Amino acid sequence: VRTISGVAVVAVMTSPGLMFNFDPYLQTRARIEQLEKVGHPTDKIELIIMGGTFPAREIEYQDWFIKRCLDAMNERESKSLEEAQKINETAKHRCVALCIETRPDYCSEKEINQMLKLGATRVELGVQSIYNEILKLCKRGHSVEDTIKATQLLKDSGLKVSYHLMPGMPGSSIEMDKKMFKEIFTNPDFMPDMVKIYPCLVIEGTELYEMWKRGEFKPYREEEAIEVISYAKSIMPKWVRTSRIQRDIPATVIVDGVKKSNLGELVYKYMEKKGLRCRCIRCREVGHVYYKKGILPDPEHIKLVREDYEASGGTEIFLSFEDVKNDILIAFLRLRDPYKPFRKEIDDKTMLVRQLHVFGWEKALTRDIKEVSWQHMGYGRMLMKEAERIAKEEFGKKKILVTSGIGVREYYRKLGYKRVGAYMGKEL
């Protein structure tokens, strides 16, 4: 069987899910209830806004949609978005993360301002491909230049950046896809924090369906998808987090393409056969290593580790606590020296804490030591202390701004941070 995490994922659908006529409150509440039915904790919630067009909707609609999702978490009505957010800072169901999915050409400064106002902590760009040939071929409404610019504006606003990517699009190839993944992790224009990967599928009613019928598009089968994703994972940097390889599309709607439901497991077994190692965040995090391999961090070998890389014109500092003998990731912090910020509260003497993650409670149903956690052991506070030290003593910055989930602001207050516009900030 699978694993129970301490963070509840609540994914909701915006208007043009079907059962609740896209009501934000009913979707959020129904998902929480459903999770409580099966004994999954719901005190910490990652809210995911699905649709990819949300940032293009009227602001009135966005504010209301997020307000009502928070109302369902707060279990009470609110007069406005801002009040629902204030209430949620101390509610029983805290919004610790808010991910908004969007097309890369709907990611202007104005839209980023609005997303920060909503409390967003992560933005998933519908990149699909980094090659303009492929994008025009499939009549996508964005360029690779859109993706690059959006990525930079997001990073320099302190937000986590996720790329949705599709191997096997029309016009592509196995080698071309492999090159795309190498470029995404070694070209500073890209360097995303997360990637969501799934091979391109043929679903009736899409342009891809039209191309497929014309004989223009033969989608990847399992073998091809496995080869590309296995390569991608073998080269993923330690600072990249991947999504569980899966899809919420039932096999009876897939005209052509990968139908089987265990693509992630197939990739894993292929990587074993070929001796391909995976060092990315999902592969090494405590809960996954315990579920997969039955072992726990060896405290004699837990160290603070640091890895730097150039991204979108600036410097990313990836700090982690890690069992370096067994290569197990316990916690990490993303610190950025920004490049060309535009937000009012970001100086040229400002460092950005874009993310702090301590892997916490986790009920591994398939192991005999069931519950395991690593919060309240000091790793988060030690990562923050190191981040402040690096910011002040190495980069000569004078203030540090934290991108904080609504429901996480209380944590940063305990560490001396105060609200600074959309962020939690501290003078160094």
Side-chain angles (χ1 to χ4, degrees), residues 148-203 205-212 214-217 219-222 224-243 245-246 248-258 260-276 278-292 294-330:
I148 291 173
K149 181 58 174 177
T151 295
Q152 177 265 309
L153 293 176
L154 291 166
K155 287 299 196 69
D156 285 336
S157 304
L159 289 158
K160 302 156 215 52
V161 176
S162 173
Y163 287 1
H164 186 277
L165 301 162
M166 282 196 296
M169 289 178 75
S172 197
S173 68
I174 286 175
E175 183 59 32
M176 186 175 319
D177 286 336
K178 289 177 166 178
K179 284 191 171 297
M180 165 165 74
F181 282 107
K182 185 176 169 178
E183 177 165 350
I184 279 171
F185 304 127
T186 59
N187 175 338
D189 288 348
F190 305 110
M191 318 296 272
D193 306 307
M194 290 191 54
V195 294
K196 183 191 259 73
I197 307 169
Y198 206 85
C200 186
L201 299 171
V202 180
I203 273 71
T206 60
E207 168 72 4
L208 290 172
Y209 177 70
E210 289 308 282
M211 307 173 66
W212 173 79
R214 305 167 208 160
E216 180 171 2
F217 175 39
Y220 278 174
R221 287 167 64 174
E222 290 242 276
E224 300 82 70
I226 291 169
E227 293 177 23
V228 169
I229 295 169
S230 288
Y231 171 79
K233 278 192 150 175
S234 71
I235 63 158
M236 251 172 228
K238 300 180 179 191
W239 39 268
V240 172
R241 186 193 223 148
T242 197
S243 303
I245 301 158
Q246 64 164 43
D248 306 329
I249 294 172
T252 52
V253 184
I254 300 169
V255 176
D256 202 2
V258 170
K260 281 163 67 176
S261 59
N262 52 344
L263 184 58
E265 179 194 4
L266 300 182
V267 165
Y268 180 86
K269 290 186 176 176
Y270 182 90
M271 291 178 77
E272 290 179 309
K273 179 175 186 166
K274 251 66 174 179
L276 297 171
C278 175
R279 306 249 277 292
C280 74
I281 290 171
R282 189 185 160 75
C283 288
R284 286 171 307 125
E285 56 171 79
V286 184
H288 192 256
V289 167
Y290 183 63
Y291 166 79
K292 215 73 181 197
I295 62 172
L296 295 172
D298 178 348
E300 288 184 25
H301 303 282
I302 298 174
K303 304 194 190 311
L304 213 170
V305 177
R306 166 168 173 191
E307 177 178 8
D308 290 6
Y309 55 101
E310 184 86 10
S312 300
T315 298
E316 301 283 2
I317 297 107
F318 185 81
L319 299 176
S320 54
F321 276 103
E322 180 175 333
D323 174 349
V324 307
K325 175 180 183 293
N326 301 303
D327 198 6
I328 302 178
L329 178 67
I330 294 160

Side-chain angles (χ1 to χ4, degrees), residues 87-91 93-100:
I87 295 170
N88 189 255
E89 296 185 7
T90 58
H93 311 282
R94 300 204 188 191
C95 181
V96 300
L98 165 50
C99 180
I100 299 176

